[PDB]
Amino acid sequence: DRGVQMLLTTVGAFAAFSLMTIAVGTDYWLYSRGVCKTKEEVMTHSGLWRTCCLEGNFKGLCKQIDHFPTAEYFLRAVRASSIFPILSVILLFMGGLCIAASEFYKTRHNIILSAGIFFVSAGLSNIIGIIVYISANAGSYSYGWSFYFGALSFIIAEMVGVLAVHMFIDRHKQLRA
Amino acid sequence: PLAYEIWMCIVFAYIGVSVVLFLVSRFSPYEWNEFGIFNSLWFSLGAFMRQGCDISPRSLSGRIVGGVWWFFTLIIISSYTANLAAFLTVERMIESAEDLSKQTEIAYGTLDSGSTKEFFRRSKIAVFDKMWTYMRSAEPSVFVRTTAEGVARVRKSKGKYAYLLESTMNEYIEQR
Amino acid sequence: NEFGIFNSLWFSLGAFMRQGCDISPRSLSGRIVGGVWWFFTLIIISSYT
Amino acid sequence: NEFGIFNSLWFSLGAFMRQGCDISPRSLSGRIVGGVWWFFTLIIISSYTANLAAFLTVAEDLSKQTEIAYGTLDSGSTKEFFRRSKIAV
Amino acid sequence: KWWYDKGECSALSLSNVAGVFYILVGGLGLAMLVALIEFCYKSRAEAK
Prior knowledge:
Chain A: GO terms for molecular function: calcium channel regulator activity; channel regulator activity; ionotropic glutamate receptor binding; voltage-gated calcium channel activity. The structure is cut from a larger assembly and holds 1 copy of chain A (177 residues) and 4 copies of chain B. Chain A has 177 residues and is mainly alpha-helical.
């Protein structure tokens, strides 16, 4: 039905925003074997910003990752900053705002398209971020639940985008009726 | 042949390429089979498996998306085949006493009172003389008191220990 | 659907030899079958080469 | 002949990537052009894959380039030998 | 004794193919930009 599409779109947008924010915040991205804090080796959370000790002499201690020790330097810069994951969160937020303004100040019909473009772009930004992260780490291990929260954020966002575009298409079909 | 993350990102990219092909192909109202979401997913899957198409994008934006997906597919599939071949080719190819004498990190010993220790002690070959110097100086005493002791020491040293002994006992052990 | 039994056998043979199709399943179920056959073909032929 | 300049470029790109065609030249001359581009693509892509499979299976600058810096012990036969030398290098 | 006796010394990874991913996402973005530009242009033309 047409009335449920807006609910699905809005609830999806909220879910994607929340998942991406939690992932950018939490520290469970990579279960590695690292140093909990310097001045030997144990399992570590190693989230996006801070690597935190677990199963150790002092389990629980968390420190900031030392991103730095020319293409390699530029990658280090793009990874130390999380421009891509952060940009994904910003874009999802703006998409949500558009969906919300779909009703108030209605009949514009381009605000929905804007929502869709924002959701799809957030997805692309999320994938670029993941590739930068994985490439930056290397040069055993495992990926935590925040990394998969990020991935689920990408999938939900792409789906919400498809729904948005579908809604825009239907609105113009009605307008052309 | 391809790492786990490569497969994961191939799937994420497939979803993204399909969604963008659908968006660019159908969002504009000034364009009203063609690529709906279902047909677009099919086009992308077929392209990755190099299995040809039933439709292809006709617009500039659609063709940009298609072109990059085609290039990505060529590099990834070629790399899968090349690395598989490297696995199989290489597969078709320390293992001596000198390699043991050279490696001092790995510890090797013999029975304390036996023809092996005497043979190394009275030897005149350089390799065996180097081995004898190592054993006579390798503290703690690499020497054992029984063959089964060396067997257990090797089986209980994370491969950091080697035992020199007569071949008949090894033949019996490998067979048991 | 131009997919009788003879056409189905041709679609499959062609897909295995990495050649053209001339028809592609249009329904959801047909598409599932085609996708798995495509993946199977890719792995087996790459391995032969 | 639906081959305009845009469609010609699409046909060629798709042939290089060994992908779908969706339109094939019907004339004799179009087919000559297509055939040679096909052969070129087969040899070049086969060789890309073969050479990747190889890649994935297998200085005197001192004086021959000053960027690298070289020196010796201050009081030694090496410094004296260089100081007493007469050879070009 | 003092020289020889003292001797003391495969699966492609994203890193190997990251570039092709970067190119893909770059292309996806360019495509979206081209489409939006065409839409905005044809929208103004729809005014007249």
